[PDB]
Amino acid sequence: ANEPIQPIKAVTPENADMAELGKMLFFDPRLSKSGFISCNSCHNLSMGGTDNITTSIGHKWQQGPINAPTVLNSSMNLAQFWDGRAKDLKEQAAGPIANPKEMASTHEIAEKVVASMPQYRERFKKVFGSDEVTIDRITTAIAQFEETLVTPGSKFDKWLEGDKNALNQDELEGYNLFKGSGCVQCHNGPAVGGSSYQKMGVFKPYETKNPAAGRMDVTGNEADRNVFKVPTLRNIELTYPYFHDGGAATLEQAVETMGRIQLNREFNKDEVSKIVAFLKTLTGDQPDFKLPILPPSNNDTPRSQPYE
């Protein structure tokens, strides 16, 4: 009778220097064509790792196609992106940099930008052995930093570890309903999700104008239409709005929809209130580190093109 959910464990970077280099790159807006957009712009670590809007604002204020997921605990995902088209964090990181709808630069340009700065070259030398800058090393460093973005210490985890007073009566009943109703069928493990692909709209379809088809984009099979990676519910309190289209503005709405179309279960108001209370106890310790200080661009650095 072991719990369907396990505590998140603290992480010690295999390569501290690499994680520091990755941190810097994650906050460097010069990886973008505009010199205005960094990974942190859309995955704000001061706010829970997302941009907290329906879909992401990209280069020249392009309205993105889908809701940006949190990077927090993303190292635990079975694959990356809503349709899992990316195998891991490293592969994922190369995407946004060259995505015309997001950072809109190119791997070639990103390499030249970083390499133009002596302070970055020195770090690549320390970390990789030589001062050569490549998108491969860049994504490897960012990935290492993201591995450290886990959030242990949530009240629920403290309860799981034996602290009976970490949860109040409503929160405990919420968890019991979460488990008893069937939510754990898909939202389980340390991340309370992120370990499989499931249909969004089991008993009834999810109503949305958003055209995303999920896994079908990868397989082309009709059976995969509307099948997405199950999101982690850790820090769900900080990652509103909800669902891939950002269609559910509140947790209550997300829970009611989930109960209704995934379990054919209409929760009453108090039941929803208790589950939501439980979900908020899944918020863990947020990133704790100094604001990164980045090296200045110099006369050799390709200049930003915010309006060009």
Place this chain on the structure above:
Amino acid sequence: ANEPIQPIKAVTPENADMAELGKMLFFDPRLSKSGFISCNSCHNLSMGGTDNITTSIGHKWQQGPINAPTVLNSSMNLAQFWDGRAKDLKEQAAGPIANPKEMASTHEIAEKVVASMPQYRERFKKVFGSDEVTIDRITTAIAQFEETLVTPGSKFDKWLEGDKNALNQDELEGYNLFKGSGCVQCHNGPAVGGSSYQKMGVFKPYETKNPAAGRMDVTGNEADRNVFKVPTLRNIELTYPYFHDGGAATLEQAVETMGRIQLNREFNKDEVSKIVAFLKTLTGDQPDFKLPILPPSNNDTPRSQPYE
């Protein structure tokens, strides 16, 4: 012992908690209508306090009218903004929040946004005795945070304080050229500028397509046309491009232009490189603090409007 420039000294917040609150607000993108733009977006503290582009990107990617100045050491300015229309940091902070070309929100909405969060209400109470949030308290807190954004410790300051080795041969000669040519007429004091309004184009006009008129926008006196607050040269190495229109991409170009139109001095390539070397020794210790962790928006919080 009587150099025209004096060292910058560390600043301990009169109210530590107030500065901590100001720090959180400075990094909060919810002060903007889009929920995507914070003070840090255009005054990036990881990069030197500016956005490092010709003019600022505002709501819906509006191309701003003028180059964004650095907030670093801004507490030393005789007034705020290129035309000095704002008397101090407190007064200045109210501008961007309600500027349709920048954050595009309103003072009323920002107050409602911040007050909707218990975590913020609690901080305002421990700071101002009361838990109610007003644009007055918001700007007071931000200004307090900005008072701490001074940058002591630059190599030049170490030199002024006794370390004869803090500067190399070229850097020292550069300083001597700076002092001996007439530059300290306008760039002096602890901020190496910021203490007066001066004409941009003393001997010859500064060519630019930018329509900014400077002090005339405030005084209406034709005599004040093209008269601006002299920018601080502290951390000038980190705040490219240069001048109010962002027209000079390099320090070499900026120095050459300044000598020509301000002093009627034509510096040869060697002299320019030495002055540039000196300017870089004005880069001080950058902000050293933990990345702010902000409270989550809740069901009572006005929702971000990035596209509507």
